[PDB]
C-alpha cells in the first residue's frame, strides 16, 4: 500500500476507561526523533487528541509514546489570523472538519474554520516544513512553549526556542531546542526572553502564504541550526518525496496480499506503527558522527541512543521482527542500549526519555539473548553479559533501575509476597536468568551458563499444585490464602492468575510436568479459553481498562488486549496439538482493523502491531532467545519477505478464505515440514514457504516440540 493512503487516526479513539490502541496520529519518518500530531483538547491530560473532536488547538511536536508515560520536550505551533483575546490554547482554538482533513504518516493537511487558514506539515527526521495558506490579512503563528522556556529572534527570518518539559527525567533541566526559519520575514521584532508556559505570537503581516522550515535538537541551539541547514533548501514537495521513500524502504520489505483487501489495509496500518519506535535519540555532529544527550550526567556524548521503549512490551514481537527484516536497525539500537548501560550503570527498562523504571522485569535481557543466538552484534555480547550479570546480582540504590528485590530473589529463589506484583517479578527474573544463560552459552562461558540455567527454573517456586496457578508466596514459603483465580492485581500486573501463570517461555515442558502431563495442561488451556471473561477487581479496588477490554469480547481469559496473553494460542503447540488453536488465531486476528477503534487494547510502541504482522505470516516468536518461531495460522495469501541477509522468503497459501481455519500441510522449499516451529536459520535460507490450508484439521501428531530447558 502507498504510505499516503495510511490514515494515522487508526487506533486513536480512546479514553482513560477503554483502549482501542491508545495510539496518537503520529506524522513522522520511521524512527523519527520527533513526531507531529494535531492537538484537539488540553482538557483531558494525555488524551490530547480524539478523532471525533472538531476542535483544533495546534500542531503538537511530541515525544509521547503512550498516555501512561506522558510527553517530554513538546510544544505547539498554531496558525492564527486577526487579533487574539488572550493567547491560551482555548482562546486560539478553531473548529475544523475531520472528514475534509488529511492525516497520513508523511503529511497533515487541515483547514481552521475560524481563521480560514489551510496548513500542511511534512516531517523529516529532525524537523519538517509547515506551509500556511492565509485568506485573511493579519497573519501569525502562535508558539506554545510549555514548562520553562527561552526564546530569541536570530534575525528577521529566524527564531530559536528552548523548552524544558517532561513527565519524568534524570536531568531536571532537560532541554529541547527548536529553530524556525520563515520564508516571509517577521514584521514585528522581539528581544530575548524567558519564563514558564510561554505563548509567543509571531507576526508576518498580510502575506498569502508562509513557509516554515523547522528543526530541533537535544544537543544545543547550534546543533539545531546545523540540523536545519542540512535541509533548509528542500521544497515541501521534495521533503514529502523523501519521507515517502523512507517509509517505502520498510514497506517494500513485506509485500503481502489477502483474499479480503480490508485485511491488507489492516496489515499496512499495523506496519506503519511497527517502524515508529524506538525513536532516534541521537544527532549527527559537524563530522557526521553520532552524538546524544546523556541525562544521567547531563552531558553531550558521542554514539547512538534510542528512546521511547518499554522492553516489557517490545521484546515480545518488535525486536524478533527486526531480526528478520530490519537487522541494520536492531544492530544500531543494541549499541544505543549498551550506551544507556554505560551511562547509568543498568540496562534500561523503560526509556522516556531516560529510565522511568515502569513495569516488572528486565526484558531487555530477552532482546539481548535473541540477538546473541541470532548472531546479531556478537561483538557487543561480552559487554552485554557483564551488564546482565550486574542487573541479576546488584540492587540499585536508585529505585527505577535494575531488578527490584534482587537480593530477596537470590535469598529465597523468588520475590516474596511483600513486594507488589511479586509473581510477575519472579517469573520475569527466571526468564531473564534463561536469557543470561543463552548469552553465556554463545560465549562458551560454561560456569555462567550452568548457574543461570538453574536459576531459570525458579518459576517452580510459585507453582501451587493445589490450584494449578502461580501464586505469591511469603518468606516462610506459604501461599497467600483466599486465592481466587479471576482476582486481578496485587500479586499480578494488569491481570489475574489466568493472565500470569504461563509466563514460562524458557521451559513450557517443565511447566507441563508440574501439571502432571500434557493432557492435564491441555485441560487447563481449554478451561482458560472456553469460560466467560469474568474478573474480580479486589487487587485494584476498581475496574481498569485492561479488564474492560477482555470483558468486551467473548475470548475467555485469553486477554489479547494485553501483552501477557499474546503467546497463549501457541501453548497448544507445546502439547503437540497446534490444530486446536489454528481457528482461534484466525479469529483473534479479526479483532484488528484499520479504523480508529482498530486494536483490541494498547498498541504499546509496535508491540501489538508486530503481533499482528507475525500472525499474518503464520509464525510467532514465543521464546525470544531460542531462535525459533512457533507456527500458527497465516492470514495472508502471499508475502514476499526481504530478509536482512539479502535473501527473499516467498510465502504462498492455497486460497485463504473465511472457511480456511487450519493448516493442512506445510512445504518449505518443496519439503514437507512437520515440526510445530521454524528455526531462524531455516527462514533466513529464503526460498518458498507454502501453506496448504484446510477447512478441517490435519493433526500431524508430531513428537517434536518447540524449545524447553528441561528437554533440550
Ligand atoms: Ca499493554
Ligand atoms: K477495539
Automatic annotation (TrEMBL):
Entry keyword set: Calcium, Metal-binding
One record GO biological process: carbohydrate metabolic process
Entry-linked Pfam families: Glyco_hydro_92 (PF07971), Glyco_hydro_92N (PF17678)
Residues of the Glycosyl hydrolase family domain: 223-694
Record carries keyword Calcium: yes
Any one GO MF annotation of this record: carbohydrate binding
An example Gene Ontology CC term for this record: cytosol
Domain of life according to the entry: Bacteria
Annotated Ca(2+) 2 binding sites: 562, 604
Gene3D superfamilies xrefs: 2.70.98.10, alpha-1,2-mannosidase, alpha-1,2-mannosidases domains, GH92 mannosidase domain
Domain (Glycosyl hydrolase family 92 N-terminal): residue spans on this chain: 6-192
Entry protein name: Alpha-1,2-mannosidase, putative
Lineage: Bacteria, Bacillati, Bacillota, Bacilli, Lactobacillales
Amino acid at each position: 500500500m502507498n504510505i499516503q493512503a495510511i490514515d494515522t487516526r487508526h487506533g486513536t479513539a480512546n479514553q482513560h476507561s477503554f483502549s482501542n490502541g491508545n495510539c496518537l496520529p503520529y506524522t513522522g519518518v520511521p524512527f523519527g526523533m520527533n513526531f507531529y500530531a494535531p492537538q484537539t483538547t488540553d482538557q483531558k491530560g494525555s488524551w490530547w487528541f480524539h478523532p471525533e473532536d472538531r476542535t483544533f488547538q495546534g500542531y503538537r511536536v511530541t515525544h509521547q509514546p503512550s498516555p501512561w508515560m506522558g510527553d517530554f520536550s513538546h510544544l505547539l505551533m498554531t496558525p492564527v489570523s486577526g487579533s487574539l483575546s488572550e493567547l491560551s490554547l482555548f482562546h486560539a482554538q478553531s473548529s475544523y472538519r475531520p472528514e475534509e482533513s488529511l492525516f497520513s504518516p508523511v503529511e497533515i493537511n487541515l483547514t481552521q474554520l475560524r481563521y480560514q487558514i489551510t496548513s500542511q506539515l511534512i516531517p523529516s527526521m529532525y524537523g519538517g516544513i509547515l506551509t500556511i495558506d492565509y485568506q485573511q490579512k493579519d497573519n501569525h503563528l502562535l508558539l506554545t512553549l510549555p514548562g520553562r522556556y527561552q526564546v530569541k529572534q536570530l534575525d528577521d527570518h529566524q527564531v530559536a526556542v528552548k523548552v524544558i518539559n517532561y513527565s519524568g527525567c534524570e536531568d531536571p533541566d532537560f532541554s529541547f531546542y527548536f529553530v524556525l526559519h520563515f520564508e516571509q520575514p517577521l514584521t514585528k521584532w522581539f528581544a530575548p526572553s524567558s519564563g514558564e508556559d510561554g505563548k509567543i505570537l509571531l507576526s508576518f503581516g498580510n502575506i498569502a502564504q508562509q513557509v516554515v522550515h523547522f528543526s530541533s535538537s537535544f544537543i544545543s541551539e547550534k546543533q539545531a541550526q546545523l540540523n536545519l541547514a542540512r535541509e533548509i533548501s528542500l521544497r515541501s514537495t521534495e521533503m514529502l518525496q523523501q519521507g515517502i521513500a523512507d517509509w517505502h524502504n520498510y514497506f517494500d520489505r513485506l509485500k503481502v496480499t489477502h483474499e479480503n483487501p480490508e485485511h491488507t489495509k489492516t496489515f499496512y496500518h499495523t506496519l506503519y506503527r511497527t517502524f515508529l519506535f524506538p525513536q532516534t535519540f541521537y544527532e549527527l555532529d559537524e563530522n557526521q558522527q553520532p552524538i546524544h544527550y546523556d541525562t544521567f550526567s547531563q552531558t553531550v556524548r558521542p554514539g547512538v541512543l534510542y528512546t521511547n521503549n518499554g522492553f516489557w512490551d517490545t521484546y515480545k514481537t518488535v525486536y524478533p521482527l527486526f531480526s528478520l527484516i530490519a537487522q541494520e536497525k536492531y544492530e544500531e539500537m543494541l549499541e544505543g542500549f549498551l550506551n544507556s548501560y554505560n551511562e547509568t550503570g543498568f540496562l534500561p527498562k523503560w526509556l522516556s526519555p531516560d529510565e522511568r523504571g515502569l513495569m516488572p522485569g528486565t526484558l531487555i535481557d530477552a532482546v539481548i539473548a535473541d540477538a546473541a543466538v541470532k548472531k546479531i552484534r556478537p561483538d557487543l555480547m561480552p559487554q552485554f553479559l557483564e551488564a546482565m550479570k550486574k542487573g541479576a546480582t546488584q540492587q540499585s540504590e536508585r529505585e527505577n533501575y535494575g531488578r527490584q528485590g534482587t537480593l530477596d530473589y537470590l535469598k529465597y529463589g523468588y520475590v516474596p509476597s511483600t513486594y507488589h506484583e511479586s509473581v510477575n517479578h519472579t517469573l520475569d527474573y527466571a526468564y531473564s536468568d534463561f536469557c543470561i544463560s543463552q548469552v553465556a552459552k554463545t560465549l562458551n562461558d560454561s560456569e555462567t551458563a550452568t548457574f543461570y540455567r538453574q536459576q531459570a527454573l525458579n518459576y517452580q517456586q510459585l507453582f501451587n499444585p493445589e490450584t494449578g496457578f502461580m501464586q505469591a508466596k511469603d518468606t516462610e514459603g506459604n501461599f497467600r490464602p483466599d486465592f481466587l483465580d479471576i482476582r486481578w492485581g496485587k500479586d499480578y500486573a494488569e491481570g489475574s492468575a489466568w493472565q500470569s501463570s504461563f509466563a514460562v517461555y524458557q521451559d513450557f515442558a517443565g511447566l507441563i510436568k508440574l501439571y502432571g502431563s500434557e493432557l492435564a495442561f491441555e485441560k487447563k488451556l481449554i478451561q482458560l479459553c472456553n469460560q466467560a471473561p469474568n474478573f474480580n477487581v479486589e487487587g485494584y479496588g476498581f475496574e481498569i481498562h485492561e479488564m474492560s477490554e477482555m470483558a468486551a469480547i467473548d475470548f475467555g481469559q485469553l486477554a489479547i488486549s494485553n501483552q501477557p496473553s499474546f503467546h497463549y494460542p501457541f501453548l497448544f503447540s507445546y502439547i503437540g496439538k497446534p490444530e486446536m488453536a489454528q481457528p482461534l488465531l484466525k479469529q483473534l486476528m479479526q479483532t484488528f482493523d484499520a479504523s480508529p477503534t482498530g486494536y483490541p487494547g494498547d498498541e504499546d510502541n509496535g508491540s501489538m502491531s508486530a503481533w499482528y504482522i507475525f500472525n499474518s505470516l503464520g509464525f510467532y516468536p514465543v521464546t525470544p532467545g531460542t531462535g525459533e518461531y512457533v507456527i500458527g495460522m497465516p492470514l495472508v495469501q502471499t508475502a514476499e519477505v526481504k530478509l536482512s541477509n539479502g535473501k527473499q522468503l516467498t510465502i504462498q497459501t492455497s486460497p485463504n478464505k473465511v472457511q480456511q481455519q487450519f493448516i493442512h500441510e506445510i512445504q518449505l522449499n518443496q519439503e514437507k515440514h512437520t515440526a510445530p516451529y521454524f528455526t531462524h536459520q531455516e527462514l533466513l535460507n529464503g526460498g518458498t514457504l507454502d501453506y496448504q490450508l484446510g477447512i478441517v484439521p490435519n493433526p500431524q501428531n508430531t513428537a517434536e516440540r518447540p524449545f524447553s530447558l528441561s528437554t533440550e
